[PDB]
């Protein structure tokens, strides 16, 4: 969808896949303010929305935490709390035509700056003059939406680039898109440091024979020390025995 009617899509409860994003060389404008561009798998934003538009040329650079211009006045606006990122694409004959593109529109005439993350779709007359504008195209009554003009050219600033914006929510509900992997296989009968789902310790992971309840994860002793932990891969309970130590 074009900038005049910019489309959004929320991402539901799933495991976020962000590793293949920076590894792709197809992105040339991965500049964004907020969290670090490396700790994406270690984030717990509640909800994520993706907004897409097909703005053209050097107009993309106006996307910043606070900026005014022909694009960020009566269209997609970026506030100072826009936590997330912006991604740009490259245009080609895939989005182009020899005759030209005329099905795309952009707002040009309005009366007041649009609020951040707001859309205003009502296009009859912007009433430049004080004369009545009951729906007759003429002087002091002009149509505020103009069609894009796209032709095969140099492409430095005259191509329909594809720009998406990912926006994150800070804190209104607990998040569900926090997926780490750590890709580690089990080891038994030998001393090892373990980080089983937040339980950091050291010991030997022997074979257990207890009867943990289905909703229980780890056991405990009388003196309140960890004794057994449920590995959530085969859902298996494993005991913990301290490293052998003593005097000489």
């Amino acid at each position, epitope marked *: 969808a074009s900038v005049y009617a910019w489309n959004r899509k929320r991402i539901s409860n799933c495991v976020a896949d962000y590793s293949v994003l920076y590894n792709s060389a197809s992105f040339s404008t991965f500049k964004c303010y907020g969290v670090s561009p490396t700790k994406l798998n270690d984030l717990c934003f509640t909800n994520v929305y993706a907004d897409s538009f097909v703005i053209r040329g050097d107009e993309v650079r106006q996307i910043a935490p606070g900026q*005014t*211009g*022909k694009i960020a*006045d009566y269209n997609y606006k970026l506030p100072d709390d826009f936590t997330g990122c912006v991604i740009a694409w490259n245009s080609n004959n895939l989005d182009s035509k020899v005759g*030209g593109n005329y099905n795309y529109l952009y707002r*040009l*005439f*309005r*009366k*007041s*700056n649009l609020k951040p993350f707001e859309r205003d779709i009502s296009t009859e007359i*912007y*009433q*430049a*003059g*004080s*004369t009545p504008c009951n729906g007759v195209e003429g*002087f*002091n009554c*002009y149509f505020p939406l*103009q069609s894009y*003009g*796209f*032709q095969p*050219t*140099n492409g*430095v*600033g*005259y191509q329909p680039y594809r720009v998406v914006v990912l926006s994150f929510e800070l804190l209104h509900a607990p998040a569900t898109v926090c997926g780490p992997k750590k890709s580690t296989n089990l080891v038994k009968n030998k001393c090892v440091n373990f980080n089983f789902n937040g339980l950091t310790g050291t010991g030997v992971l022997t074979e257990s024979n207890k009867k943990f309840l289905p909703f229980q994860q780890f056991g405990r002793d009388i003196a309140d020390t960890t004794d057994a932990v449920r590995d959530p891969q085969t859902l298996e309970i494993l005991d913990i025995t301290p490293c052998s130590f003593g005097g000489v």
Partner: single-chain antibody
Amino acid sequence: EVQLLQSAGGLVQPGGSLRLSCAASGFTVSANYMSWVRQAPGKGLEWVSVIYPGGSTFYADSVKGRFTISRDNSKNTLYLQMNSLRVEDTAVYYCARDLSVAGAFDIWGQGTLVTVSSIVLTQSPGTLSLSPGERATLSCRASQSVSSSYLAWYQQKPGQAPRLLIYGASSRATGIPDRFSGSGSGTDFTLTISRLEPEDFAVYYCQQYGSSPYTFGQGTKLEIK
């Protein structure tokens, strides 16, 4: 009947302050585009500032910050305050509404004069002295090779305000006689005037918009052999 009035006919002391004024004659200034252009006598015209609806201020590339432009809806005015003035700032300060996509600078102001103490766009043909009774060709080349419809043509007049001839190089403005034609694509645009009339010998300018700061041509005058 649209009229734009200015009052800036006053010499400025060095390092002094001035206040210009542009009025309105029926159209609200809070809902339309306005632009300021420097006539630069003896050379091509240039850009100064633009005010969108709203009131965000856009300045030219060479000049930054010092010029203070404001819009006053109470008195329907387009005030521009001039700070400390330096050398080589003597020109005219036209103001005009802007509808770049559909009609480029349809109506302009009238003109004034401010004194001092004590995109690569070119026009090819030149003076091209001729006589009435035939046509002529004026070629305007651009380095950035704008795609379709971001170039327009204006007509200067000695002592008067510039007037729009064709917007977008495809269709002429309202009231323009049908003897003006335009063509060309890619890099250059050609303008042709048929059956030249006595009220046609005037300087033609080609200007670019819809891009980095607007640039006008150097100036092509029409003179009789």
